[PDB]
Structure formats: C-alpha cells, structure tokens
C-alpha cells in the first residue's frame, strides 16, 4: 500500500533523433524531432521551423524513419519503440484537424534473444519492400511491407555474425541487400547479404567480406548514382563497392570520434559528419565520370566546417541550413555558408533551442528570498556544460509603489500630442477619479479640465482628432488638446447612468442596462448613431477595430445578465448572429475580442473565476471551441499590454495569468504577483514600457519577462558541472565541475577553450601533500558562484587526478561556521575502485576560500549528506559517520560495511539513512546507544540504482536503470526479525527516463502530500507526490477508464508502457499514477469525457475540477 | 572504472 503520483514538470528537451522528408504533404519539407516520448513535427520554412504537431508515444522512440512505397502520396513514418513496439504512422489532416494515424503495429520483441551491443537499429530498403531490424545478437528480424501486414508480423533469420556494429540497406540492388560491419576476434569486417523472403534465408551479398578498422562504426549507404558503403572509423574513413576501395586518414578527425552523419545532397556528393567534440565536418565525394556511363568516385575529403553543439542528430534542411540535434547540450539551427567569416567558420548559428541537458544534479532556490523555488541545475556535459535556473511563471519588475485601497480601473494618458509617453494616470476610484500628472518619474495629484474628480470614471481612452475622453457614471465627457476644456460632454436623454463602458480611439459604445447606444468623437464633439435594447441587462461589451479597420470598428460581442450568455452582434444595426448559452448563475464580468499572429479571438471571463475562450471571424462570426478554464476565484478583468509584436492579453484575478500565443495557440501562464485587480500598458518619460498594476492597495509598474509557462536562465560553464550546493549565508552556490585538458609536449596539460574554472574571478589549487608514488585528463574544481550575478567568484582546483564527487554546504558540530565539504577520489586508469580519496572542508570568507580541514580516506567519497551536526559520507562500499571536533577536525564514530557500492544516501531528519549501487537500497539507523549503525532493513532485489530519496519515515523512492521507479517500505509484520529485515517494493513504474537527482522542493506556491522533484538525463523534470488511498483509487480507476477512451498514438497499451521492466522481469505498475495520463483528460472532448464516467459519488465534470486542482502542483 | 562508468551513465549513452 504505497500510493504515488508522477507528472512531467518539463518535457524532455534532449533530442534523441530527427529526420527529414515529406510526411505532411508530397510538396512540403518536414523535420521530425524525436525527444524521448515525444514526436515533434515541423515544416521547414524560409524562416526556419513552423511547428505543426507534438504528439507523445507510449514508449521511448528507438527508431524513426520516413519512407514511401509504391502508390503512395506522401512519406509514411516507421517507429520502433524501446519496448519493441513497432508501428507505422501517417500524417492526416481533416482540413483544420490534425491526426497522426496508425496504419500498422505489432510488438516485435522475441522471447528469445539477447539485445546486442550498440542497441536497436531498424532499417528500410530503398524499394520499400521491407523493414530490417536488429534487436538481438544473432538474429535479424524481417518485416515485409504489404498492403496487408497491418500487424507488422515478422520472421527472424539466423545471423552467424553475433556482434554486428551497424547496418544499412545498400542502394541499387536487384535483391534487397544489407551491408554490415561486424566484430569477431580477428578484428572488424564489412559483409553483405541479399535478402530473400521467398525462403526466409539470406543468400550472399554482391561482395566478399572485406576488412575495416578496429573502431569502425558507422555504415552509410550511398544513393543510386554511386552505390556502395561509406564506413567511418576513428582517425579514418573508407568506401566500398564491388571491387572499389577508397580510403582517407585525415588527422583532423583523429581527435574525436565521428558520431553522426547525414546526407546533404540526394546524389550523396555531400555528407555532414558530427563529432564527440561539436565539430562539423563535410564529407565530399569528389565528382567524376566517363561519358555514356554512370558517375564513378575519384576521391573523397573532409572539410572541417566549424563547430556546433555536440550532436546526436544532424539534418541538412533547406539551403545551407542544418538542424543540429543535441542531447548533451542545447539544440540549434545553423547556417552553412560558402564563405568562412572571422575565426574561419562557415558555420554560423541561427537558432539555439534550450536543452535542460542531462541534468546531473540540481537544487531548489532560494534566490530573491520570496517563497517560490527556482530550480538550479547542472546541465549538459563538457562544453555544453551549464547551470540553468528555472523559475515557474512570469515575473514583473516593480519601480514605484503607491498604496491606494481603491483603484477600480486605470487608463493610459499622454498629455502631450507628440510624445509616445503618457505622463498622466487617471484611475477609477471609490466613486471618484484621481488624476496623476507625473513629473516624469515623480508622483503629483492635481486637476484636469473636463475630467470629473468627484465621479467614478469607467473609461479614459486616447481618442483621435486631438481630444481626451472621460466616460463617467454620468456623462461621456470630452476634452481637447488645443482648447483643453469641455469640448462636448454627452448625457443620456433622461438623466440615466451609464452601466457599462467601451471605446478604442475613434469608436464609442456605452450601455445603460439592456440599452445600447453608439457615439463618435467627430472633430470636437460627440455625435450619436444607434439605440437597441436587449433581452437582459448588458454585463459586458467588447469593441476594438481589429484587422482591416483603423479606429472605426467592425462587429461586436456581448455578455448579458440573467440568462448568463455571450453573443455575436454587428454595429449600427445591432443584429444578433450566433450565440452561446453558457451555464451558471454567475455573470460574465468581461468579454474580449482581439488579434494575435494571424487570427481573431473571442474571450469571456465570468465572475466565478473560470473562463471560456472562442475564435471569432472578422468576416463570418460564429462558434469555435467550448472549454472553460478556472483561474482567479475573483472575476477576471481582461486587458491588453505592450510587449513586442505578438502583444497579448493580461488576466487580472487572485491568480493573475497571462495568455500568450503557442503554436498559433494561446498560452496560459501564471504571473508572479500577489493579486492584480486592473492593469494597463504604459511608456512615461520615466516609466517606459511598463504595465501599471493595481491590487487591493498599491499601484505598480514594470516590465514583463518572456512567456512560456516556465522561464529559464542560463549560466554557460564551457565545462561540465557535476554537483551543486547553495550556501545561503554566503549568498552563492558551490558547484563541482570538471574540464578536460591534453597532455603537453612532455606531460603537462593546456586548456583548449576557456571554461568557468579558468576564467574565474579569483582562484586556488590544492596545496595538500597527502600522497606520493594525446593523453586526456580531467581537472576538477569547486566553483563559487554568486547567486545574484552567476559570476564565478572563486575557483578551487583539486589535485592532479583527484575527483570531487560529493558536495555539501553545512554547519558542523558546535562550530557556528558553514562549510563547503567535498568528497573526492584519486583516480587512475590502472584500477577501477579507488583506494584513496579525501574529504576537504572549505570556508568561503569575505571574498576568501579557506581550506579548513582535510581528511584522507581509503576509497572514493561517493556521496555524503550532512547528518545530524555530524557528517555522513559514503567511502566506497563503506558508509562512515564523521564528527567535528571542537578542535576543528573530521573524526570517525561509526561505520557500516554491508554495501556493494554506496552511491547515494539521504537522511530523514531522524537517525535514518538509505542506499546502494547494484543491490538496490538499504535502510539504516544511527544509535545514540554505542553511537552506532543498526541496519534496519534492505531490499533484496537486484536493482542497479541511479537515484534515491526518502519521501517519509516509511516510504523510500528509488530510480534505477531500466528507467524504472519503485517505492519501498518497511513490512508491518509478525515474526519481526525477518519480515522486518526485508522491505517490500510496494510501488513500481516504468518512467521512461534516467533519474540522476531527487530533491524535496517545489517550483510553485507563494490533494497531494510532499513534493519531490527530479531531473533526468533527458532534461525532463518530473515531480513525485504521495497520495491518499482514495485519490489513488479515484485516479487508478480513472487511469483505466481514460485508456479505453484515448487513441494511443501507435496503438500502444499504456499499461504495457508503464510496466516496471528490466531485461529480466516485467510487472505492471503499482502505487503510481502519471498525472501525465490523468492530465490527458482535459485535452478531451466532452463526449469522450462523459464516457469516462459510468460511475461518495461519481459526476461528469466534478473531475474536470479535480484534474485542474492537480495541474497546479507544478 | 565505476567512477567513469557512473558518470557516463548519469549522462546517458
């Protein structure tokens, strides 16, 4: 009985694969980017990427190829998952609706077979007769492609070559032929086979098995005009066809392994190659020919083009542009040019796409001492290495702050016709209007002719033809720029009050109840036009001359009072078109029409807090999409502000929201304010682009960040960070980091590019003498990072061949000082289980790093949490507990040795600890008895752990290596010295990700219990919470209902997907829910949703609310 | 050594 919830906080950002072709249309260039469990679909444009579709799958995409057989309009997509789910996908659009379809599927795992070295490789023959796969050593799996075979059924063929490296289907082959580099004892060899389904055997290929180099590793098959295979080694590259053999050994490739190729030119005259380094090569097939007779290949060469982010994926797109698929660092768009500018790099970066990288460690914050956590992560590796601060929501920067418990609206007035700046703020008040002539940045409250000061203003626009406007309770006044007095002033013919305002800069519409008017500020006076009553009382009115209108404004939209409805109308007529009869006894407190990139929209906030958004047609004007969304428990006021181009809508509530503009959609990100009542743009000669905000009591004005739900700040490190600690008292982070450096002309090491550790403000090296007994080495550092500036305050360099591996920041013993302790490891390529290392105690002084204490140790200090005023530390197989003398030294009390390799420890305040490497997780207490360790319980499963966290006194979370999560707890059991000694895995789950780090923290706040964040190798941030048995059940059941109803892309059983699974065991998930699934709910049509309820109670949309309440834990 | 092999893992393939 363990009960948990897991949700994505940020999807994986690492790019796992990518591919190009025409999957959208026969005449349209798509790039498909595979993240982990996400397919991204783009059209390549002149600008770059137009996003088209972002589907998920129930699987880690292992194979992604586009293909097209005979009689096929556009490229089908083949996908093999890691759990061996194969499928074939087709891009389908119903004019406005986009759907990816499953043309076939089948699971292709074989109960037999070991999964080979070098992983899954699927492939596809040029003629599209079939799909060849290599999953298992010895076996090659063949899947004929035929109109039928919708189940992708497949035979195996035996393969003498037990240890294949890479394989491709050769071009221009009468028979389906494959080409493969295999490795036996003798070396590595290229070989071929024709492939016949006719009789489920191979035959022989068109050419003798040749040889290839010891590190040979990529096969490339060159298209029809050339044929044959390009095979890429280390320090070398070669070509093969029948009798032809071409070779090259440019030293320029020697320094790093090529790692991806991609063809540029269909003929294959040109190819791109990427590197462990980021270097981008161009591999050219020197042209050549001999009259009537196909093109030969005289030669081939490498041209270093420059540098990219480290590339998993590479894909030439349109003209000179290349997408660089990165997993170790940020992905990017990148222009190649015939000319190499400064530095001599034909490769200029165009776009850079954020990868939260492999997140190697991370921590909450803890910055502007507010109450929300910023998450700070060590990311990337090598030169992509970085920190990334991640802050949920959109912040705003406050300049002035006038405490005003009234403000009931506010409007943006310039007092000088010329200047784009507004030096006045007129604001609705407690049945009043205060004016604010600002002396630039200074506040001062005075009169202003024709602008009533004893009247609750309800509007105040910037009306053209040199005039000002002030709609009050009473009369819709008018004031001049030339005269500046009472130019006009309207007044209802009966002495009746205006109930609801409206205006832009030329158009004027008021209402008095059910009544409607319409005025115009025609030079120096208000002339009326229409009048029309309505069913019920006018709740709200929107009008802004949208697209094809300059001041004068097309159609109209309205919310009424008894029937609680919102309805599309026109103008001088006032003719009712289509309408919606929204439910509820609560009135639409605000209606809005707008424009964005290329679309018009109708938005309606009610007073319950919830909202309805719909799309308007400047021409036609009718329905769109029914779907309400809760936000500010208090009526939402909607406005529109200055930002950039896509200028957007601000939602004022208890829960202030912005509404962005996604993939031509509209974002719904939180704003980091206490509350907002009303809000408007600005530009004073002393408060430029700022939106003034007003709450219960206070005016405020400032800029607005980007948008995207979440914001990400990035400290580029150039080297590869490893661990990281915040030491608040000293307002900085320590970060363990490593760079790499070469052996010199004798042994010394240089420093290719500058990194954070060499560009440091100050610096250090270890003096300590505790020891005494081309080539790449690592150099490791503690870094002091200013929390405010993210400057490398100080760098401490560690000893030759010493590894910092663990980092704490704590106070120790009675000692009222706070240290950065660092566990380390003396690492030589001779052994493989360090026998020496150290614990070092640092202090960071005024601007200073004082090596306070060191401690030799007889193994690698893997992890070390601060225990209980003492220092607990894992020292290779043996966990120890060090105390801090008064006389300032780390000295032992106890150790425990029942550890194959203690990699991870964590501490629930109490004298309780937990961890391990290949035999997943022990629990241990510390005994104020013989100040000792009593091993309370382990878990007797063979889990190769990666991360480990304590959720509560009983619950222990672990991540491991198949990408599985599992929870453990202590067995409440009779016979309490056995069933006791054994804790049971009472929650299992296949996550789909490698978890490096857990931590208690949350991204949110100023249903669920606890909040543990996680960072993955893929840049996914998850979150794990605990559950009441009842929510569990509600949700567990809901999980099942939800899956009968959702069309899982490639027809993959969700439950099959989430199934705890190693290559030696497969159990269904228990004690876990993907909120990711749960949340799938909301993206569902109401019909499909109603279905989900067939049966304390069971409703229909009480849940629509339950699910919302959760989306809000991250 | 495991160290290296523990890195390579924390950082995928």
Swiss-Prot record, chain A:
Residues 2-768 are annotated as: Interaction with CDT1. It comes from Homo sapiens (Human). It comes from the Eukaryota. Residues 13-356 are annotated as: WD repeat beta-propeller A. Pathway: Protein modification; protein ubiquitination. Belongs to the DDB1 family. The keyword GTP-binding does not apply. Pfam families: Beta-prop_RSE1_1st, Beta-prop_RSE1_2nd, CPSF_A. The modification N-acetylserine is found at residue 2. GO terms for molecular function: cullin family protein binding; damaged DNA binding; DNA binding; protein-containing complex binding; protein-macromolecule adaptor activity; ubiquitin ligase complex scaffold activity; WD40-repeat domain binding. Residues 392-708 are annotated as: WD repeat beta-propeller B. Protein, which is both involved in DNA repair and protein ubiquitination, as part of the UV-DDB complex and DCX (DDB1-CUL4-X-box) complexes, respectively. Core component of the UV-DDB complex (UV-damaged DNA-binding protein complex), a complex that recognizes UV-induced DNA damage and recruit proteins of the nucleotide excision repair pathway (the NER pathway) to initiate DNA repair. The UV-DDB complex preferentially binds to cyclobutane pyrimidine dimers (CPD), 6-4 photoproducts (6-4 PP), apurinic sites and short mismatches. This is DNA damage-binding protein 1. The core of the protein consists of three WD40 beta-propeller domains. Component of the UV-DDB complex which includes DDB1 and DDB2; the heterodimer dimerizes to give rise to a heterotetramer when bound to damaged DNA. The UV-DDB complex interacts with monoubiquitinated histone H2A and binds to XPC via the DDB2 subunit. Component of numerous DCX (DDB1-CUL4-X-box) E3 ubiquitin-protein ligase complexes which consist of a core of DDB1, CUL4A or CUL4B and RBX1. DDB1 may recruit specific substrate targeting subunits to the DCX complex. Keywords: Acetylation, Biological rhythms, Cytoplasm, Disease variant, DNA damage, DNA repair, DNA-binding, Host-virus interaction, Intellectual disability, Isopeptide bond, Nucleus, Phosphoprotein, Repeat, Ubl conjugation, Ubl conjugation pathway. Phosphorylated by ABL1. SUPFAM superfamilies: WD40 repeat-like. Residues 709-1027 are annotated as: WD repeat beta-propeller C. GO terms for cellular component: chromosome, telomeric region; Cul4-RING E3 ubiquitin ligase complex; Cul4A-RING E3 ubiquitin ligase complex; Cul4B-RING E3 ubiquitin ligase complex; cytoplasm; extracellular exosome; extracellular space; nucleolus. It is found in: Cytoplasm; Nucleus. Its main location: cytoplasm. It is linked to White-Kernohan syndrome: An autosomal dominant disorder characterized by global developmental delay, variably impaired intellectual development, hypotonia, and characteristic facial features. Some patients may have genitourinary and skeletal abnormalities.
From Swiss-Prot, chain B:
It is found in: Nucleus. Highly expressed in skeletal muscle and testis. Expressed to a lesser degree in heart, prostate, and adrenal gland. Signal peptide: none annotated. It comes from the Eukaryota. Interacts with the nuclear receptors NR3C1 and AR in the presence of ligand. Interacts with DDB1, CUL4A and CUL4B. Ligand-dependent coactivator of nuclear receptors. Enhance transcriptional activity of the nuclear receptors NR3C1 and AR. May function as a substrate receptor for CUL4-DDB1 E3 ubiquitin-protein ligase complex. This is DDB1- and CUL4-associated factor 6. The lineage of its organism: Eukaryota, Metazoa, Chordata, Craniata, Vertebrata. The chain holds residues 9 to 21 of 860 of the full protein.
């Amino acid at each position: 009985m363990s009960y948990n919830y897991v949700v994505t906080a940020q999807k994986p950002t690492a790019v796992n694969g990518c591919v190009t072709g025409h999957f959208t249309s026969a005449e349209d260039l798509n790039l498909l980017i595979a993240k982990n469990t996400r397919l991204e679909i783009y059209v390549v444009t002149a600008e770059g990427l137009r996003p088209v579709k972002e589907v998920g799958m129930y699987g880690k995409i292992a194979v992604m190829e586009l293909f097209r057989p005979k009689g096929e309009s556009k490229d089908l997509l083949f996908i093999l998952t890691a759990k061996y789910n194969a499928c074939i996908l087709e891009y389908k659009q119903s004019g406005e609706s986009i759907d990816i379809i499953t043309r076939a599927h089948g699971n292709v795992q074989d109960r037999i077979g070991r999964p080979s070295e070098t992983g899954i490789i699927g492939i596809i023959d040029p003629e599209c007769r079939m799909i060849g796969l290599r999953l298992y050593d010895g076996l090659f799996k063949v899947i004929p492609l035929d109109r039928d075979n919708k189940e992708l059924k497949a035979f195996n063929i035996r393969l003498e070559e037990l240890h294949v490296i890479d394989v491709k289907f050769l071009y221009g082959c009468q028979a389906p032929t494959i080409c493969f580099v295999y490795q036996d004892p003798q070396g590595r060899h290229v070989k071929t086979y024709e492939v016949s389904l006719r009789e489920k055997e191979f035959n022989k290929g068109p050419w003798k098995q040749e040889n290839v180099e010891a590190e040979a590793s990529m096969v490339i098959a060159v298209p029809e005009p050339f044929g044959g295979a390009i095979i890429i080694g280390q320090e070398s590259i070669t070509y093969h066809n029948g009798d032809k053999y071409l070779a090259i050994a440019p030293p320029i490739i020697k320094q790093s392994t090529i790692v991806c190729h991609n063809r540029v030119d269909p003929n294959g005259s040109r190819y791109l190659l990427g590197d462990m380094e980021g270097r981008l090569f161009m591999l050219l097939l020197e042209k050549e020919e001999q009259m009537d007779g196909t093109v030969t290949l005289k030669d081939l060469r490498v041209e270093l083009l420059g540098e990219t982010s480290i590339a998993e994926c590479l894909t030439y797109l349109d003209n000179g542009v290349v997408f660089v698929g990165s997993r170790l660092g940020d992905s990017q768009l990148v222009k190649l040019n015939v000319d190499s500018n400064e530095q001599g790099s034909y490769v200029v970066a165009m776009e850079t796409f954020t990868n939260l990288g492999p997140i190697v460690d991370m921590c909450v914050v803890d910055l502007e001492r507010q109450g929300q956590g910023q998450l700070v992560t060590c990311s990337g590796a090598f030169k992509e290495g970085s920190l990334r601060i991640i802050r949920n929501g959109i912040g705003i920067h406050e300049h002035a702050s006038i405490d005003l418990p009234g403000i009931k609206g506010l409007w943006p007035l310039r007092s000088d016709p010329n200047r784009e700046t507004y030096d006045t703020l007129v604001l609705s008040f407690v049945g009043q209007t205060r004016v604010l002539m600002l002396n630039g940045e200074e506040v001062e409250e005075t009169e202003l002719m024709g602008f009533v000061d004893d009247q609750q203003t309800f509007f105040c626009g910037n009306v053209a033809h040199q005039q000002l406007i002030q709609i009050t309770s009473a009369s819709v006044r008018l004031v001049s720029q030339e005269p500046k007095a009472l130019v006009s002033e309207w007044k209802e013919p009966q002495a009746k009050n205006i109930s609801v305002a409206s205006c832009n800069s030329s158009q004027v519409v008021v209402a008095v109840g059910r009544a409607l008017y319409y005025l115009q500020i025609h030079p120096q006076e208000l002339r009326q036009i229409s009048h029309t009553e309505m069913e019920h009382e006018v709740a709200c009115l929107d009008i802004t001359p949208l697209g094809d209108s300059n001041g004068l404004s097309p159609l109209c939209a309205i919310g009424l009072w008894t029937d609680i409805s919102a309805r599309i109308l026109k103008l001088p007529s006032f003719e009712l078109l289509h309408k919606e009869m929204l439910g509820g006894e609560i009135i639409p407190r605000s209606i809005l029409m707008t424009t964005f990139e290329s679309s018009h929209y109708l938005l309606c906030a009610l007073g319950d807090g919830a909202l309805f958004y719909f799309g308007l047609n400047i021409e036609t004007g009718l329905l769109s999409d029914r779907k309400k969304v809760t936000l500010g428990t208090q009526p939402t006021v909607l406005r529109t502000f200055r930002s950039l181009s896509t200028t957007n809508v601000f939602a004022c509530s208890d829960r202030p929201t912005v509404i962005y503009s996604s993939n031509h959609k509209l974002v719904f990100s939180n704003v980091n304010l206490k509350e907002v009542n009303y809000m408007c743009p600005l530009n004073s000669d002393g408060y430029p682009d700022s939106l003034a905000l007003a709450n219960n009591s206070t005016l405020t004005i400032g800029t607005i960040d980007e948008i995207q739900k979440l914001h990400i700040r990035t400290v580029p490190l150039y080297e590869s960070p490893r661990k990281i600690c915040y030491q608040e008292v000293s307002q900085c982070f320590g970060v363990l980091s490593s760079r790499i450096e070469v052996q010199d002309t004798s042994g010394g090491t240089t420093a290719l590019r500058p990194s954070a550790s060499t560009q440091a403000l100050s610096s250090s090296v270890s003096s300590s003498k505790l020891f005494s007994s081309g080539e790449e080495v690592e150099v490791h550092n503690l870094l002091i990072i200013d929390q405010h500036t993210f400057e490398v305050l100080h760098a401490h360099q560690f000893l030759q061949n010493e590894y910092a591996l663990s980092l704490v920041s704590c106070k120790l013993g009675k000692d009222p000082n706070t240290y950065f302790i660092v566990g380390t490891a003396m690492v030589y390529p001779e052994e493989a289980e360090p026998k020496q290392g150290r614990i070092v105690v640092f202090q960071y002084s005024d601007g200073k790093l004082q090596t306070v204490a060191e401690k030799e140790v007889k193994g690698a200090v893997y992890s070390m949490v601060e225990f209980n005023g003492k220092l607990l530390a894992s020292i290779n197989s043996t966990v120890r507990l060090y105390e801090w003398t008064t006389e300032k030294d780390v000295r032992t009390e106890c150790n425990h040795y029942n550890n194959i390799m203690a990699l991870y420890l964590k501490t629930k305040g109490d004298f309780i600890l937990v961890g391990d490497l290949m035999r997943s997780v022990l629990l241990l207490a510390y005994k104020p008895m013989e100040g000792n360790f009593e091993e309370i319980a382990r878990d007797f499963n063979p889990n190769w752990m990666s991360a480990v966290e304590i959720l509560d006194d009983d619950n222990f979370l672990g991540a491991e290596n198949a990408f599985n999560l599992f929870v453990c707890q202590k067995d409440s059991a009779a016979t309490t010295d056995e069933e006791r000694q054994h804790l049971q895995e009472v929650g299992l789950f296949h996550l789909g990700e490698f978890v490096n780090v857990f931590c208690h923290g949350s991204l949110v706040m100023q249903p669920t219990q606890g909040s543990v964040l996680f960072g993955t190798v893929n840049g996914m941030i998850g979150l794990v919470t605990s559950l009441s048995e009842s929510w569990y059940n509600l949700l567990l059941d809901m999980q099942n209902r939800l899956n009968k109803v959702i069309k899982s892309v490639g027809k993959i059983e969700h439950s099959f997907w989430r199934s705890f699974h190693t290559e030696r065991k497969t159990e269904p998930a228990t004690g876990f829910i993907d909120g990711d699934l749960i949340e799938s709910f909301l993206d569902i049509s109401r019909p499909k949703m109603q279905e989900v309820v067939a049966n304390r109670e069971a409703t229909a949309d009480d849940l629509i609310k339950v699910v919302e309440e959760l989306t809000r834990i991250h | 050594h495991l160290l290296w092999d523990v890195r390579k893992r924390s950082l995928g393939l």
